[PDB]
Design a protein around this ligand. Sequence first.
Ligand SMILES: *C(=O)CCCC[C@@H](S)CCS
Lengths: 374, 341, 79
Amino acid sequence: PKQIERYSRFSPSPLSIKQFLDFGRDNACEKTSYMFLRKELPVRLANTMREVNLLPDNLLNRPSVGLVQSWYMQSFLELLEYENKSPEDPQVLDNFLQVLIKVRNRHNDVVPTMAQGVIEYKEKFGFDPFISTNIQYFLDRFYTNRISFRMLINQHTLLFGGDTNPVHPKHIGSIDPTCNVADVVKDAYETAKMLCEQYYLVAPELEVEEFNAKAPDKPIQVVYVPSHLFHMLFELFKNSMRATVELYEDRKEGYPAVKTLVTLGKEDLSIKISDLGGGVPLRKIDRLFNYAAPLAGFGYGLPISRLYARYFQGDLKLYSMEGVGTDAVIYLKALSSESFERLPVFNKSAWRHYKTTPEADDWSNPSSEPRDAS
Amino acid sequence: KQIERYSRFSPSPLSIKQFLDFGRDNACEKTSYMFLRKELPVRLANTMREVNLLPDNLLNRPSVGLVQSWYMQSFLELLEYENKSPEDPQVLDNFLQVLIKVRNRHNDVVPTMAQGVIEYKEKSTNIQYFLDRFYTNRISFRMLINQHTLLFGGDTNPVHPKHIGSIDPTCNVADVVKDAYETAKMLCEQYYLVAPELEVEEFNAKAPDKPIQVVYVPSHLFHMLFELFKNSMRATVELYEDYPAVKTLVTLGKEDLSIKISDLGGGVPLRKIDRLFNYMGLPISRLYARYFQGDLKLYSMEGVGTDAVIYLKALSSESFERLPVFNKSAWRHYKTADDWS
Amino acid sequence: VLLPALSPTMTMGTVQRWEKKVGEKLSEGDLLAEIETDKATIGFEVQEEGYLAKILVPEGTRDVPLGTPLCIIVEKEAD
Ligand SMILES: *C(=O)CCCC[C@@H](S)CCS
């Protein structure tokens, strides 16, 4: 923990989408990249391993957690073994590349194990408030960091691993410079539909409207990682299609379409997916992003889906009118120049959240059995 | 020390059902007296502690001095009935006059506190917190005092006889909508000589035939809809130089009463939308909604329009007051950030 | 530690939950417990300095009258 103490005290370094792009497009210099990553990757790692380290002792004790920590630690040290190796011989650079491969795979199953250590703690220790709001805090940051970690590695391997036949030939790493939002929407939909189709033999049609304020007829495109977006959309379509079928299943009107509206303004790219699934009480809407019918846990889940959005200064929000339907909205920055990575830093400000004792409520709270007036 | 004593007391939340029951069945002016003479100075204490935890360069301000004393004033005037006997009708008449005096002292039509935060034009929005609680409490003051005066005021010609105080036990929301809109439209016509039309639709999930009703305080709901309707028209008109109707939808389900107002006024960027709630109007409307466990949300499609939505608890039993308690927690907010880039 | 008058008209409350462990240190203000009178559910905060020696009214006890000895505090922590 001495090096871990030192690196953790460094602050991550976020990059705008523009920056990833201009870098793999203008520069394309594997020297600068190794230079940045041999520091940046072990930093983000140490700023994460530090937090998980401040979890409640019951949780930290789950074999799934100590397991995670060790994988993180190792990857940390294999990387730390470059603090001074120079980017001059293509021997170093070539071997860095390989390490990135290794750790990517090594970590491939971190999310799985993590989720396992938390559940194994829930149904083994306690339903209380503050402890649970804590874990929420931890996971948003834990996962977001993870998301960012792969983002950085993917850009380096795709850019310099030079795999002869690139799956996506126009892309810059994972970034689509000319991404058609309407297109990623139809695909996200097409596939949630196919699933629906197989498990319900039925499915709500899709409806799309674009409105480009910026330039009233040029289709709405953006600089983004297509796959990230696709996943958020799928998640939402899956949910609106489930809710719709389930309600109109015993009626006799067919299935109301699921409407989508994409808009591009001066600084917001907004996408809205509306459905008439019966809406949901406000009360439970909030719960949705926390960690007599079933059928299809396929996507990433709303929580992760939203991390993806928030990751590049965007957001995902749910609005519903209980009794009628729901409006799910994804917000993405119109400009890549404003699309900076949103990373969790391990500083004392973070420290406080894992070191707080329950407190009194800032506001009033009703009796469970109030005095009857009269 | 008096203040200290009343501040350690925790505000007592009342639900719309309790408010409706008491003034419909009991309606005992003697009791209400007994309740209000203790509760009000309790609520006044808790707001006064926080105001006094305000960074001095603000507590300093002219407008703020004015306020701190004003609350003090009310706190004392109401404490002389600490142990006076309701038995003599005269005590009740004076008490009724004191309520009328504090109700005016703390009206929000005359922005004092707000302007005190303007003088701050001389010289990190932890100010947002305070005001939201500050104002929330005065919403309650008025709620408690209007109930009493409406029930025991002796006005032999109430505007709404079947009302219980300021509560309409069969509040036909659609009508409160038209009212809010018709007055907005009027304020409009006055500077634009024709405003966007109003389109309304309800859907009573609970019984699609019946028009949507609910036990609520019409005036409160009016302020919220007026404000929004106001904003939806201003935008629609300001954009469309030389109009797209304003659409409203009212829905009612098991738990929620949702009222949505939408305009095609070109929308707003997400970034700014938030700033529509810190005091840098719409913030009070939302306090009104949250006061009885409801809420007000805004969401826009920058480049197209806006969706303002009001959520109210469909059951009087679950419409409790949400009051600002002063304790350690409350205290912490006045002595202190980012762990994200 | 006596059960106090948390609201003007109060007479008796109910110890909903204890938020401090017997042995733990008590700083002027720390949330000590959850008391649910019939007016509201209140978070009872510590008044004096001290250490939780022991509790006298178990978690969940209902209708506890005013003045009821809730629990005992002790100055130094060797008791
Ligand atoms: C406790 O005192 C029970 C509250 C009942 C009286 C309230 S509803 C007064 C109406 S102002």
